[PDB]
Amino acid sequence: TVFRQENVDDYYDTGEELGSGQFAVVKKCREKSTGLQYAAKFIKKRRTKSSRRGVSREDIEREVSILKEIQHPNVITLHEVYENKTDVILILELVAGGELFDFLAEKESLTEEEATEFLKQILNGVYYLHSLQIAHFDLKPENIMLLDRNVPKPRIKIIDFGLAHKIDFGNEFKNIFGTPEFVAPEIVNYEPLGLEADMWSIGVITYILLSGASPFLGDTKQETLANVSAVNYEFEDEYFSNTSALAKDFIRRLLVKDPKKRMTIQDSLQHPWIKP
Ligand SMILES: Oc1ccc(/C=C/c2cc(O)cc(O)c2)cc1
């Protein structure tokens, strides 16, 4: 599928940089015809078939195809796509309140009410995605953006569909692999993957929200991955002594090695810690 090949600068002006990663940079921008503001994600294309730099056309097209399906208050949306010889440029919805990661670095730990206010929105977004058989595969606090961080109960949107896949057979076997602290054991073990992997990541996020600590983090990536595969985590009393047993139960039923025994998104919404 081809994208708009007019110069994006003919239609948008860019401003502050929002972040950058291995293959992409995101810049705030403003559409000239409407004055409306967006986030332009410039993804570097692969320059040869066998290269390891840049992102393959197949991978870019997958991210775009999934994003085109999405319209939900808790998930980022896609406005337009441009391309030139060097980049594909996604014109994404602008969510300007910063990463949940940075919000957490300030509070250092959330109350259960604050955590569940965020988690209910994350669960609602993931429920929408999983209902469409979309596995995100990269859920973590850096990929949850706040609309406005200066309100008591910030609203959020899930971002970053660079690893997302449609799961139309119940599992995909593609060597998908995200951030070690957040990947499920089936990712670590290179096993068939499905929607269940996201539910594990939600368990990790919840543990972090409540404690400020990462459940599986070792001193090296290989230690973290070994800890994940072995389900090597525990609720440290220093962090969790005043946390409810029901909150621990919610986490415990997500950090389950066997994907078939792990809570699904629907289970998580009915769990007594979440359900009103
Ligand atoms: O509306 C938005 C759409 C996308 C983004 C992306 C921000 C971002 C943050 C990082 O730490 C690294 C990165 O590569 C990108 C921010 C807002």
Protein described:
The chain is α+β, with helices and mostly antiparallel strands and 276 residues long. It folds into two domains: 7-97, no CATH class; 98-276, no CATH class. It is 32% helix and 17% strand. It has helices at residues 57-68, 100-107, 112-131, 185-188, 196-211, 221-230, 237-240, 245-252, 265-270; strands spanning 12-20, 24-31, 37-44, 78-83, 87-93, 134-135, 144-146, 156-158, 165-166. Strands 1-2-3-5-4 form a five-stranded antiparallel beta sheet, covered by helices on one side. A hairpin with a 3-residue loop joins β4 and β5. The radius of gyration is 19 Å and the shape is globular. Resveratrol binds next to β1, β2 and β5. Belongs to the protein kinase superfamily. CAMK Ser/Thr protein kinase family. DAP kinase subfamily. Residues 12-274 form the Protein kinase domain.
